Design an enzyme around this catalytic site. Sequence first.
Site, PDB file in Angstrom:
ATOM      1  N   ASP A   1       0.875  -0.691   0.025  1.00 38.90           N
ATOM      2  CA  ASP A   1      -0.099  -0.087   0.132  1.00 38.90           C
ATOM      3  C   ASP A   1       0.723   1.674  -0.085  1.00 38.90           C
ATOM      4  O   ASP A   1       1.309   1.848   1.367  1.00 38.90           O
ATOM      5  CB  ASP A   1      -1.017  -0.089   1.507  1.00 38.90           C
ATOM      6  CG  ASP A   1      -1.736   1.174   1.692  1.00 38.90           C
ATOM      7  OD1 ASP A   1      -2.242   1.689   0.440  1.00 38.90           O
ATOM      8  OD2 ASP A   1      -2.187   1.645   2.246  1.00 38.90           O
TER       9      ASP A   1
ATOM     10  N   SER B   1      -1.026  15.676 -12.055  1.00 42.83           N
ATOM     11  CA  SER B   1      -0.857  14.948 -13.109  1.00 42.83           C
ATOM     12  C   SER B   1      -0.904  16.250 -14.030  1.00 42.83           C
ATOM     13  O   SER B   1      -1.754  17.827 -14.118  1.00 42.83           O
ATOM     14  CB  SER B   1      -1.816  14.569 -13.209  1.00 42.83           C
ATOM     15  OG  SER B   1      -2.214  13.909 -14.291  1.00 42.83           O
TER      16      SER B   1
END
Length: 330
Positions: free
Chosen positions: A35, A199
């Site tokens: 994770d 992004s």
Amino acid sequence: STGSATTTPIDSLDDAYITPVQIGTPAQTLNLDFDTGSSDLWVFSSETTASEVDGQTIYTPSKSTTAKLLSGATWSISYGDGSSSSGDVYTDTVSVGGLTVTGQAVESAKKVSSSFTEDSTIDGLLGLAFSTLNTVSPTQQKTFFDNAKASLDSPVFTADLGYHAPGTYNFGFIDTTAYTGSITYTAVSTKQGFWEWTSTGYAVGSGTFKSTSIDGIADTGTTLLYLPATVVSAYWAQVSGAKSSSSVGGYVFPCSATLPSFTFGVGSARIVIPGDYIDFGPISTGSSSCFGGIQSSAGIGINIFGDVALKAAFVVFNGATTPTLGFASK
């Protein structure tokens, strides 16, 4: 040193991935959920409340010659999905894919929430976010990666998740055979303890690319792609009959649909998520309503590039003094 381990989907939907991990001496092999959005290595154990164990493999520290109680240390964690676990702490030898760390904090669960009990395939979590998020008190502990780092050939790990297939976690090297083209690196903020990046924008299907900054985290422990409501609405508007269902808890679509791809930007590069990756199947067994793999982050407080996005790429988690993320097509 290096390590290389195969990671395997837990079910036909790629809801999560499990990676075998050796703990203790002699080795006890547990299948952990790696994770990158948390920083605790915790396991089902001989200490876990018996009614909360249903098929998991447990760690038994009393059977490990190298286990030592980390006296006084406790831990307690709550995840974004409302799940939780807590317990006490041992140090022991932990190996992943041939890479060994001695003295790793192994957090032994005394209690786990129902979602963990109900998932027999996951024996615990191995956190790979920054060690500033580790929940051990009163002495915070380091992740497996942070303890391995100084020994690794390069201070990196890579995630290469499969679509309905096994993939690979590598530690200490970048497998130049595992991706196509070049790797595009992008800046990381560690301010929230995550692999947080920005992004450069998105496209829906064959549509034009929208240049827009989307800050979010690279999180292997989250199944889906959670993005701003504007972006998500633009995606689902291209699927006839898709709608947001408050009863189901997100966007659903007709199972008869063919989904468009979704592109996200990494600097000037582009990662394309095929439409099929965004199909999470019937909402309930036999339903003709299917659950979408792109969902709004509006009710979270952060955008999450979970497995839906990451499995479309070869992803480099660069833990050098200035951390960065890299993405390549594959």
